[PDB]
RNA sequence: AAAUUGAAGAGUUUGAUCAUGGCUCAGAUUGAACGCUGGCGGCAGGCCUAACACAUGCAAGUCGAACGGUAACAGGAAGCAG
């Protein structure tokens with residue numbers, strides 16, 4: 080039911096009196112392929128434990144995205160820390176034209192066609208955060224009409 | 238009718254981190270050259286350097302329906318003779 084993807088595993092270190100203690104971090108995303116997506120970040124002495132923790136957090140941190148037939152509603156910009164991302168809808172058959180970190184998020188969320196670009200820092204943790212922020216801030220015609228007190232036809236008419 | 242269907246990142250500074258920042262790579266292209274190799278065909282392309290110097294052959298003639306003419310050769314006309 081839920082598609083899970085491991086985006087990056089990194090080895091970090093802290094120094095103690097006897098020397099360096101290594102550990103691992105895992106960044107993952109989960110999604111239902113129908114507008115729900117979440118990301119998890121886990122730390123452990125071992126890679127499988129870190130990955131399991133990340134999946135556990137991702138399953139709990141899901142948000143909702145208003146998709147339009149497997150594409151975005153409109154161009155969106157997202158930002159987190161040094162990472163800036165830009166995404167726009169594309170015609171059917173275009174595919175996911177995006178870098179790896181954005182691609183995992185978009186694919187588990189269920190975006191099938193999109194043109195994307197990452198500016199600034201391409202650190203995967205912050206790129207994932209910026210991508211999810213843009214998707215969560217995307218608007219749909221229903222929301223726009225409701226908030227403006229108009230009808231969907233008046234929003235998208237002549 | 239149709240003739241703007243369009244946008245990917247990665248490595249490297251630290252014990253580790255986030256940022257900044259340069260360097261490096263994956264693409265496409267060429268009047269190309271070199272190394273190894275090499276079956277056929279079609280279409281195109283071929284001194285980018287010395288606007289350096291050039292053997293030899295050819296790259297601008299034609300008109301006798303403008304004209305005086307006859308160097309040929311081809312007849313016509315006169316004579317002679319194997």
Ligand SMILES: [K+]
Nearest residue numbers: 089090091092
């Ligand atoms: K590391």
Ligand SMILES: [K+]
Nearest residue numbers: 248249250251
């Ligand atoms: K180095």
Ligand SMILES: [K+]
Nearest residue numbers: 248249258259
């Ligand atoms: K860099």
Ligand SMILES: [K+]
Nearest residue numbers: 250251257258
């Ligand atoms: K330094």
Ligand SMILES: [K+]
Nearest residue numbers: 094251252253
């Ligand atoms: K330090």
Ligand SMILES: [Mg+2]
Nearest residue numbers: 250251252253
């Ligand atoms: Mg080192």
Ligand SMILES: [Mg+2]
Nearest residue numbers: 284285286288
């Ligand atoms: Mg020349």
Ligand SMILES: [Mg+2]
Nearest residue numbers: 295296297298
């Ligand atoms: Mg000639």
